[PDB]
Amino acid sequence: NSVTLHSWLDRYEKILASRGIKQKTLINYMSKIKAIRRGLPDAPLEDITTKEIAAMLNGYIDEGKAASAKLIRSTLSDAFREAIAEGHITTNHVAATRAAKSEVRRSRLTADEYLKIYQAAESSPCWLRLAMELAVVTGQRVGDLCEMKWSDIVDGYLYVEQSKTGVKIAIPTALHIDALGISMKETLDKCKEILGGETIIASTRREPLSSGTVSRYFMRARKASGLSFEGDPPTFHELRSLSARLYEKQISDKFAQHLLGHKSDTEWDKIEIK
Amino acid sequence: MGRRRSHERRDLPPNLYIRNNGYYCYRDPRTGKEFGLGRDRRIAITEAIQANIELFSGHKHKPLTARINSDNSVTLHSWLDRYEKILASRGIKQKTLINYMSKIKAIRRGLPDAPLEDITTKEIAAMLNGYIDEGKAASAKLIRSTLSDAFREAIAEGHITTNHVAATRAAKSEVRRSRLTADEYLKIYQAAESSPCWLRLAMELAVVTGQRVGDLCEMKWSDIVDGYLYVEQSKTGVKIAIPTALHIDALGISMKETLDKCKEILGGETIIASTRREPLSSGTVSRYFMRARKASGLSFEGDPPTFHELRSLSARLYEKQISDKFAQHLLGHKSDTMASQYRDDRGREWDKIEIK
Amino acid sequence: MYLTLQEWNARQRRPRSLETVRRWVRESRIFPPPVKDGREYLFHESAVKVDLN
Amino acid sequence: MYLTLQEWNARQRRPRSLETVRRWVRESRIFPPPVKDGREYLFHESAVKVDLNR
Amino acid sequence: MYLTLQEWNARQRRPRSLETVRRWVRESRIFPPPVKDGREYLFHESAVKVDLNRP
Numbered sequence: 079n080s081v082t083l084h085s086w087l088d089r090y091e092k093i094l095a096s097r098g099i100k101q102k103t104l105i106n107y108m109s110k111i112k113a114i115r116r117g118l119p120d121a122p123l124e125d126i127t128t129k130e131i132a133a134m135l136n137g138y139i140d141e142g143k144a145a146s147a148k149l150i151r152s153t154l155s156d157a158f159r160e161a162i163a164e165g166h167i168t169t170n171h172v173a174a175t176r177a178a179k180s181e182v183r184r185s186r187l188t189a190d191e192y193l194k195i196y197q198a199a200e201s202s203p204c205w206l207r208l209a210m211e212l213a214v215v216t217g218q219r220v221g222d223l224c225e226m227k228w229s230d231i232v233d234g235y236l237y238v239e240q241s242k243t244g245v246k247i248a249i250p251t252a253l254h255i256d257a258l259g260i261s262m263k264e265t266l267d268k269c270k271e272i273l274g275g276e277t278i279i280a281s282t283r284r285e286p287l288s289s290g291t292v293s294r295y296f297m298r299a300r301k302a303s304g305l306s307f308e309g310d311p312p313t314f315h316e317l318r319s320l321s322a323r324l325y326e327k328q329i330s331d332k333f334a335q336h337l338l339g340h341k342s343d344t345e346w347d348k349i350e351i352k
Numbered sequence: 353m354g355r356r357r358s359h360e361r362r363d364l365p366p367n368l369y370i371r372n373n374g375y376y377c378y379r380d381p382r383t384g385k386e387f388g389l390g391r392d393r394r395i396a397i398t399e400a401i402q403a404n405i406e407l408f409s410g411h412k413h414k415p416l417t418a419r420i421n422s423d424n425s426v427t428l429h430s431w432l433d434r435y436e437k438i439l440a441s442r443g444i445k446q447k448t449l450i451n452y453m454s455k456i457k458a459i460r461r462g463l464p465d466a467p468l469e470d471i472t473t474k475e476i477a478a479m480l481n482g483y484i485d486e487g488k489a490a491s492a493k494l495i496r497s498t499l500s501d502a503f504r505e506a507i508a509e510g511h512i513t514t515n516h517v518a519a520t521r522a523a524k525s526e527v528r529r530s531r532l533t534a535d536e537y538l539k540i541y542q543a544a545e546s547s548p549c550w551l552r553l554a555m556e557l558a559v560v561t562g563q564r565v566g567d568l569c570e571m572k573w574s575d576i577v578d579g580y581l582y583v584e585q586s587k588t589g590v591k592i593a594i595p596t597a598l599h600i601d602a603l604g605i606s607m608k609e610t611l612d613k614c615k616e617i618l619g620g621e622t623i624i625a626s627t628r629r630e631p632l633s634s635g636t637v638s639r640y641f642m643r644a645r646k647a648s649g650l651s652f653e654g655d656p657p658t659f660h661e662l663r664s665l666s667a668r669l670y671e672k673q674i675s676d677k678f679a680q681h682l683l684g685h686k687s688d689t690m691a692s693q694y695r696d697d698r699g700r701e702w703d704k705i706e707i708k
Numbered sequence: 709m710y711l712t713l714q715e716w717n718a719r720q721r722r723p724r725s726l727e728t729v730r731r732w733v734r735e736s737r738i739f740p741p742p743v744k745d746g747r748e749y750l751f752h753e754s755a756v757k758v759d760l761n
Numbered sequence: 762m763y764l765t766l767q768e769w770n771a772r773q774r775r776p777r778s779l780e781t782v783r784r785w786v787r788e789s790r791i792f793p794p795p796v797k798d799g800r801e802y803l804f805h806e807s808a809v810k811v812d813l814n815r
Numbered sequence: 816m817y818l819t820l821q822e823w824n825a826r827q828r829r830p831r832s833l834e835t836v837r838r839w840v841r842e843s844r845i846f847p848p849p850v851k852d853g854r855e856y857l858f859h860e861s862a863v864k865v866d867l868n869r870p
Contacts, residue, residue, distance in 0.1 A: 129510020139441075175508045181443065346582065346591045349681050374760060391761045710775070745775050763828045798864055799835075803828050 081122040086166065087111055090157050110153040113146075123161060128171045135175060144180040151177050183309040187316040189257055189324070191305060195296075198303040202295055208269045209279050209292055210317060211260045216249055217321030217337045220314055224289045226278040228270070245339040257324050363393070365407075368400035378403070426467030429460050431511065435502050455498040468506060473516040480520060489525040496522055528654040531700045532661040534602050534669065536650065540641075543648035550632065551640050553614045554624045555662060560607040561594050562666035562683050565659055566634040571623045573615070590684045602669045653699070667694060710743075710750035720757070732757060762806040766795070769804040785810065817850070817857035827864075839864055 094107055117134040118126065131154070138147040155172035162170065192214070199206045213223055221241050230237040236249040253262040266278065275284040279292070293314035300311055322334040335343075360370040369377035369386060376396030377386035390396040439452055462479040463471070476499070484492045500517035507515065537559070544551045558568050567585050575582050581594040599606040611623070618625045626632045638659035645656060663683065670679035680691055697703060713730070717723050732738050733749060739758050742751040764772075770782045786795050786802055791810050795802035818826070824836045839845050840856060846865045849856035 127510050128508060132509045176505070179443070346593060347681075348593055349595065349678075351595075352675075352677075743774075746777075750775065765829065797866060798828065799831070799839075801829065 082120055084120045086161055107153055110150050113150055114154055123167045128174045132175050139178045144178045148177045185307040185309045185312050187312040187320045194303050195299055199299040202299055204272050206295055211265045213317040214321045215253055215260055215262045215265055217318055220292055221289050240339050247339055256328050365397055365400035427465050428468055429465040432456055455495050459499055468512045473519050477520050484523050489523045492523045530652040530657050531698050532657040532665045539648050540644050543644040547640055547644055549617050554637055556605050556610045558662040559666040560605055562663050569624050569632055569634050572621055585684050592684055600669055711753055713749050716751045763803045766802050816860055820856050823858040
């Protein structure tokens with residue numbers, strides 16, 4: 079015999095542990111499995127009906143967390159699909175449901191807003207301002223900005239190894255944003271004088287900092303400025319979105335794509351005469 | 353009663369028993385005694401069944417007053433009421449939601465409020481075809497499409513196993529609306545004289561820009577900067593910029609001459625206002641256009657043209673006047689599937705094939 | 709995983725003689741039915757004495 | 762995946778004496794044969810008993 | 816890739832003694848036979864003990 083839902087979810091986690099994926103990634107799925115535990119009773123898989131699955135799913139959709147429902151529904155479905163592979167059951171009662179379409183409500187950042195936040199970051203340490211200008215001049219993600227060492231800079235270049243995708247690019251130390259008044263070179267040297275550490279962005283103790291504190295302190299200066307938005311207040315990651323939006327009208331669109339680390343393509347167009 | 357109902361009787365006929373040793377007996381309507389029938393359940397049951405007769409329609413249960421009950425109670429209308437709520441959470445564009453409700457209110461009036469599982473495919477086609485013979489072919493297509501989706505959500509929430517609506521056919525419906533010609537445009541133009549002034553300007557502005565009627569009565573004079581008319585559609589929501597340097601040589605109208613002709617005559621916050629310096633609904637600009645249509649004394653095949661046809665005629669002229677790549681961006685289109693369908697004639701004027 | 713004839717009858721309420729229990733085997737009076745290993749029968753831990761008629 | 766004679770007898774319907782386990786191998790009553798590797802048989806992960814008779 | 820005397824024996828179904836493995840090498844009970852390199856023996860990746868006897 080040996081059935082039951084929970085018993086399977088325990089033998090399912092080990093399966094994903096051999097899939098060979100990122101660390102943080104494996105953790106994301108685990109958090110989804112635990113939610114299913116306290117979301118559905120402990121009984122054989124062949125007993126679980128599609129109704130109970132949608133009863134728990136919609137429960138997270140009404141609470142406002144529609145995005146979470148999508149992942150939990152997409153993860154719970156994979157468990158059953160791998161369960162059938164073992165010969166446990168015969169059908170996937172999760173493929174009968176429908177994922178709730180969620181729309182991104184995280185507002186973007188403009189030029190005026192950024193200037194209002196940078197000045198409000200005065201009460202904050204002396205590395206936040208540097209992290210802001212750097213994240214906008216390089217347009218890189220907060221994750222790699224913390225793993226940047228002064229050894230990466232080679233003859234006027236900036237070797238950056240993206241952790242997320244894995245793309246490898248080299249941003250020259252000649253860039254400059256013509257809208258806020260920031261220069262790549264002047265920004266880097268400003269970090270070598272003020273900060274002074276092994277990494278371009280360090281702490282007051284001359285030591286590397288986590289990527290969870292760089293955007294954390296940025297939030298404090300966000301609510302301290304006193305700016306209202308529509309939806310969810312922008313974050314530190316938005317500096318990356320603002321970076322490209324500026325470089326597209328400062329140089330070229332093909333430049334913003336190469337700066338971010340993209341390869342493929344994927345508002346108010348103009349109707350030319352021809 | 354003495355024994356009342358018991359638990360074993362719940363699955364046994366009236367004149368049947370069930371001892372402690374899993375044995376069954378055959379009561380006698382003469383003295384009250386009994387004999388030995390069988391050891392099995394369905395066997396001893398069927399025996400007592402063939403003895404007098406079967407059960408009945410449902411269940412007896414008739415003590416003195418009443419008690420708790422928890423039986424089945426499936427219903428279609430009950431589900432529909434819960435379906436209308438789920439739709440309001442799918443993020444719709446107002447109007448579209450009303451369309452659904454208009455199709456749901458017709459189903460509950462054409463189909464019993466019986467259990468969903470009891471709803472056969474036959475009773476679904478009986479009502480469907482009832483609206484196909486009345487000429488309402490397009491209606492039958494929307495009603496079946498909306499009703500079919502209602503069951504897909506039902507299956508997802510543990511109610512039914514299969515959709516008996518995905519088995520029926522969808523009634524095809526060809527467009528009966530005729531197309532407008534340039535020689536017909538001027539005729540209506542002269543028949544709009546008896547009509548207000550804004551009707552002779554809204555018609556020239558809906559043929560020079562080729563914009564939707566709804567997005568034609570929502571354009572303010574502030575949406576015109578440096579000679580560019582920034583228009584944000586409401587249907588698809590695609591933004592565009594129409595230059596004031598556009599004129600049709602097939603009708604003799606300029607967009608810079610028509611625009612300024614709406615600033616003095618009309619005068620208002622909107623390019624196309626009324627006689628009270630106030631905005632005008634989209635479901636009225638077309639109304640006053642139909643009057644001049646019938647008054648002009650015309651004659652078409654099938655359903656007569658309309659104000660929306662001004663968008664079709666505009667693109668038809670913008671394809672021969674300049675190019676095809678021009679009458680594809682001005683309309684706000686991007687796909688390459690309707691660029692050939694919005695070019696058709698439908699059987700109005702023969703596609704004159706020149707040397708080229 | 710299984711239980712011997714003695715280990716199964718010893719857990720019963722009214723432990724009958726070996727022969728009698730062996731007879732309920734040939735008469736299929738025990739379901740789930742026991743399987744024969746080599747010389748002894750190994751019933752299931754949930755196997756019960758289904759007394760019918 | 763190959764197991765020993767002791768580990769194999771532990772994963773059967775009924776664990777018997779090591780002597781009896783060795784007997785089956787000698788009498789060729791298991792598909793496939795263990796194949797002596799040095800001085801200790803190595804059962805296959807799918808090597809199950811068959812049992813004959815007359 | 817060539818494994819050593821210890822590495823090869825550490826990947827068998829049942830790890831034995833170093834002196835024991837040395838005995839097979841002399842009894843040709845290792846197919847294929849290891850190669851002499853320096854002072855130790857280098858076995859093949861798919862090297863597995865065999866029985867050169869037909870009773």
